[PDB]
């Protein structure tokens, strides 16, 4: 595996926390890189980009990693939970446009669905309307 800090965060995690898009693009081009790598608690780089609202980092992951797992979880918290709980609606739209409606069905350990964090009925409609249809 790659080098980690004390939290188990790799350079991929750090780029996604720090919004280092150019660094991220290089790292995503490395052979044998695992975009789904987990830190010590289990969070992925995609979780970090979604939690912090780093929309361009999310876009780059989704466009450069066909094998990214959008259902990875810690305590049931998926990337879409992370994004919507922190109000990052644009990231939520990107995730749903890539992953389809299975993302909307995931309950976290507290029994929350990702749309439970969206108060506006009209934002909920826009999120559903952009969701990939398979």
């Amino acid at each position: 595996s790659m080098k980690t800090n004390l939290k188990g965060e790799t350079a991929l995690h750090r780029a996604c926390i720090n919004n280092q898009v150019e660094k991220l693009i290089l790292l995503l081009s490395l052979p044998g890189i695992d975009i789904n790598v987990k830190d010590n608690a289990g969070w992925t780089p995609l979780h970090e980009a979604c939690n912090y609202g780093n929309t361009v980092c999310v876009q780059e992951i989704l466009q450069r990693c066909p094998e990214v797992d959008l259902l990875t979880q810690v305590d049931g918290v998926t990337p879409l939970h992370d994004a919507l709980s922190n109000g990052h609606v644009e990231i939520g739209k990107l995730l749903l446009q890539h992953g389809g409606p299975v993302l909307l069905q995931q309950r976290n350990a507290k029994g929350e669905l990702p749309l439970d964090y969206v108060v506006s009925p009209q934002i909920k409609e826009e999120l559903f309307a952009i969701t990939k249809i398979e």
Binding site: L6, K7, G8, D39, N40, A41, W43, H47, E48, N51, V74, D75, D82, S85, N86
Partner: peptide, 12 residues
């Protein structure tokens, strides 16, 4: 009220 990720500290 921004929810941040819980972390685990470990140095192997």
């Amino acid at each position: 009220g921004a929810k941040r990720h819980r972390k685990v500290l470990r140095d192997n």
